[model samples]
Target: IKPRIREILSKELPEELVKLLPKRWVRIGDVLLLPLRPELEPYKHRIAEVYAEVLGVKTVLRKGDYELLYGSDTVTVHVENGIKYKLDVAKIMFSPANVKERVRMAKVAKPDELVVDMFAGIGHLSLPIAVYGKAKVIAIEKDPYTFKFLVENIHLNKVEDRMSAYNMDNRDFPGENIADRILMGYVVRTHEFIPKALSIAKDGAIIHYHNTVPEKLMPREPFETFKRITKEYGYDVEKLNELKIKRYAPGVWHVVLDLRVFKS
Candidate 1:
């Protein structure tokens, strides 16, 4: 894939400019002006074709530079299919806008383990986790559309035998403590739900947290937020990881923070 980017970049940028731009980063407008036309002219088209073939889809068409699929039951990217969920009946539920990131986060679990998606939107994280990880997932979606779509997708993916879909919230997990991976897709009130989640999390449990960085999060970015919250709550940050720029507003990026809690 890096080679593909370099190949496309070489045609658009001057030799000196290409060298400075580096791999994985290039100017889109400049790349269009490469004097030498290569054999693989439409690299993006070829890449899309390969992806569609891998997924057993007929043809992948680009709506714009970003290809999209607009099905009545769902609207999602072909590559990230089964992750971005669409609701069938209820429309109030908010879809998991960052399905790909959620998928990546939830995949850390082993197959067959029971994973609970607190904010499971339209089966985006739930379905992918079910299919990829082959894990038993409990999907709790509040919105009718998402909840509907989540169930439909379960039938679509044929993983119903290994999954469970419910319409509820984090507070309705049917018990006090359970679940191997508790997934959080909501950006607001992340800390507000921390106490609730920890109350049920197994000792040294994993919590997948998501939020938007209004500003580029640097060293001091959330130092105060983390300190104040952790100080008051008495939990620790066992592992902290982040995903930025790929699936977020231009300057404002979405952040996934993985925290493992231990009782103090």
Candidate 2:
């Protein structure tokens, strides 16, 4: 795929410049997220058009802020692992790098478990759980636009009987100690919501906590902070597992830690 994109652009772009073309891109639904080199700035739209045509997608985005480069209608439904996700690519943030975590969510819940997704973006993580696990889910999305898809996805996946959505900041969600499992799928400021996650968690609920941490603090930081906060709230936690999702910044890493928290 990369070679084909380069072949076509080579004719329009300079010889040395063609070599600098982006070799990797991400596809979400029918929208293509293409990372173009600064050298290709002048021809980005034309380049995007060619890639979108060859890749058979409807839209092309620049992959950073995702400024539209080709086509229109960023709304589309994407099917993955037998689940349907309807989202507006232009507005919502979907990380293809988090595919593993999405799949993992499907298997983590039990049929009788109640899963609460605090930062549900188009039901990215919770849809899998509600669909495959057949678990009851409470999906909370802060953004109204994103929450619209979350509600639509619940019906699209035919899990509306078991899943419900709330368009509000998760901290304002009134459920307390109700969830058997909690999903803190937001990054960077994820730790800020830990106490709220605990407040929503049942006695022995499992929390899939996602965050961004500097590499220098690795393997300890995100968890250490979680531990300290849990203790402050008179709770205890057992580390279940940790996964490196992707690189957030030059020296920072995006990671998720699975933890079992016990209420005091």
Candidate 3:
């Protein structure tokens, strides 16, 4: 398909321009997310049109900023690893790279445990727990618009009985010391919510903590900060494992730490 796309564009675009065309693109349902080099700016639409036609997709969007390059209607239902995710491709954020972590969450969950997802976007992390692990889940989303699909997804995946959705900031969630497992899946300032997660966690609960840290400060700093904040709230933590998810920026990485926290 890629070779065919290039072959057709080679005739319509300059030889040098053809080389700049994207070889790789991400497709979410009928929508295509393609990365374009600056040299291909003027020809983006034409390129998108060609890719969409060849790829049999309804819409084509540029990778970053996601400016529509060819089609409209960014809303679509994407299936990953047998899980259906209904989201607006243009309005909501879904990273393909995070698929592994999503699958991991499913396997880690226990049917007898209660899981609380602090930053559940369209039930991205919690759905698998309820569907595959058969665990009980309470998913909270701060954005109302995003929450709409989060609610729909619970039904779409047919896990409504085992899972529930809340449309409010996780910090405002009323449950306390009730979760056997807590998922702190937000990045950048995830440490700021450590106290809240600790408060929501049971006596000896496991917390899947996600954060972004500079490479130079990492392999130590993120866990160090989590430990410090947890202690401030009268909780002791055990670092079970740390994983590098993806690169967030130059010299910075997004990481997830599997931690067990208990009150002293």
Candidate 4:
């Protein structure tokens, strides 16, 4: 695919410039996220134009995302693994890297369960549970603009019968001891929300906790932090699963732990 793009640009660009063209890109719906080099700065738009035309994308957004290189429209509906995600490429933070985690959510819940997504971002992980697991979901997103798409996604997925959304902080959510499972999908600072999750969870509820940890803390730290916080709240936890989702930084990892929590 990169070569095809290189082939098209080989004619319009100098040999030195053509060789420096990007070899990788992320396509979300009809929009493209292209990363360019400093050497290509003078021709960024032109380069992205050829790539977009060859790739058949409506818009070409520079990888930083806020930088719009080609085309004006950034809103698109990205369909992956039978799920439709309608979002604005410019403002929303949707990464294809988390696709597996999103897909896994569909298989983890039971239809009879009530799943509370504490930090739902446009229904990224929770939609699968409603669409495929057939479970009831309450999605909470603090960002009002993001919550709009979260609500729209529920409608787009036609899971309104089993899913709902709230545009408020999870800590302010009123339900107590009502959830069968809870999703704490925030990258870090999730430990601070343990108490709120506990309040929303039924006894023996499973919490899908996500966080970013330095590699040195791996095999222990994130879970250790969670354990300390849960204990402080007068609860106990059992780690059911530990997964390294991906690399978050040079020496940091994005990890998730599935834990069963209960008051002791």
Candidate 5:
């Protein structure tokens, strides 16, 4: 719990629970707590043990559920209170969790080269890429709510000068010059559009491709989409210098493909 929550719990809870149980709250990441209700959180005990195992310590407690996971050195995204960003719309499809992860991973580059976000929803991928020190973001959003949020988020981050938002189908948006990086995070089906993403990427660009696969444990999705797209463009997967699995989605699979391809 946060400070305010702790004060309320102290005033309301019975003296017995407070005295016998831990009084002070413990925080992990952005999570905090008060005195009670810690048991209600799932995996509370397990996470506490994992924390101990990873931290090389004993006795770990959780405070709350809000985990402010950091992606990189850029300041966290902020939306002012009582103030809604001005944009085209306000609904979206992707979860903030994976979105933040993608943003954080992409921010690692801090590049001075332009980026193209084919599926830049609510500026989740775009604003972070731009403000976190990329050259410029040429982003696209097809959903009206998401497009509104995208532009608004760009403005919210004050990276408007480093970003551009287009409300149109990503496929319909014609190619400009190649970009140093490309970001796309949607359902794995978007794999079909890799050709479109490739047409505008710089010769040695980095592509963050999010895909969904149906296997549970053993078999991998083979990522034929990447190979096929690269081969179609005369790019060789054999030259891929780096490939890493950044995450695994629940009951499904969402893997990030960091591929090195040339403009042929």
Candidate 6:
């Protein structure tokens, strides 16, 4: 009788009774309680114990164990600016920032063009291009855990026909000179990929470049370094736009430059 009444209840009850008992919930540790309705009124004791075993609880309260609560599936979908993103609420975490950059990607790409995202974490930057800009994308994510979600988002948004993913380091990516736009959206070491970015860029391709900059040297920053490297690699670089993406520290900021790379 020691609670977990669902186990005892499962044998004698109609089994049709299981569905009704677990449809709602509230919280407490180990102890479960739930209310019984007009029909469930007769079998509350045994039903609670069955609920306890199936639901992973030791004890059941008449009122609940009271796995008594609501639903359990944690995967969910959210739409921002009409681009839908789905992930496990119990697993992945993000909020409160990057709305600007994420939405900005939607407006930048030209239709039917190919865009390569070197660090496409669950399609963060490139998804907007595929979703709103109507472009094709090759997204590369180094982490397989995150790659799984990136694939899910593409399926969720109905862009499987337009978007594709690879689980590998961007540096190991095999594409070259084929992109209409290249998204170098990763930070900290973004500068190191300029050579690789240059390798995959078409003659008139636009590259969205991102990096971390310190306010102390804000006057002499990343785009300058980009131009020098791009020039040394024998390409002409033109700065079309510059923007601050987010503040990374008291003195450091994450910034992006829209640069057009061409053969010299």
After superposition on all CA atoms, what RMSD does each candidate show versus the true structure?
A: 9.7, 2.0, 1.2, 1.4, 9.8, 12.2
Per-residue lDDT of candidate 1, residues 1-264 (tens digit): 445544666676556654543222111211110121233334445443433433344433332232322112224323244443333221233323444565675467788567778887666566777887887788887766557667877777788899898887767667445766778777674767766676667667677766655665553433346445765767665655655523456766556677676656
Q: Which has the higher lDDT value, candidate number 3 or candidate number 5?
A: 3
Give each model's clash number: 6, 0, 0, 0, 8, 25
TM-score of each: 0.60, 0.92, 0.96, 0.96, 0.61, 0.70
Task: Name the regions of candidate 1 deviating beyond 4 angstroms.
Answer: 1-106, 221-227, 245-251
| Model 1 / residue 106 / CA error / Å | 6.9
Better of 5 and 6 by lDDT: 6
Could you tell me the TM-score of candidate 1?
0.60
Candidate 5 residue-wise lDDT, 28-125, digit = tens: 22222223355424434533343334333333423332232211121123332212233321123333335346446544556678788888876655
Query: Per-residue lDDT of 1-264 in model 4, one digit per residue for the tens?
Result: 677777778888889888888888999999999998999999989888988988999999988537989999998999988998989889998998988899899899999999999999889999999999998999999999888888999899999989989999998999999999999999867788988998899989999999889989879879999899888888999999998887877899999899999878
The Cα RMSD of model 2 versus the native structure comes to: 2.0
Q: lDDT for model 4, on a 0 to 1 scale? A: 0.90
Model 6: per-residue Cα lDDT over 190-214, one tens digit each: 8899999999899989999989988
Q: How many backbone clashes does candidate 5 have?
A: 8
lDDT of each: 0.57, 0.89, 0.91, 0.90, 0.57, 0.76
Q: Which candidate comes out best when scored by lDDT?
A: 3
The digit string of per-residue lDDT tens for model 2 on 141-182 reads 999888889899988999889999999999899999899999
Cα lDDT of model 3 by residue, 67-108, tens digit: 999988899999998899999999898988888999998799
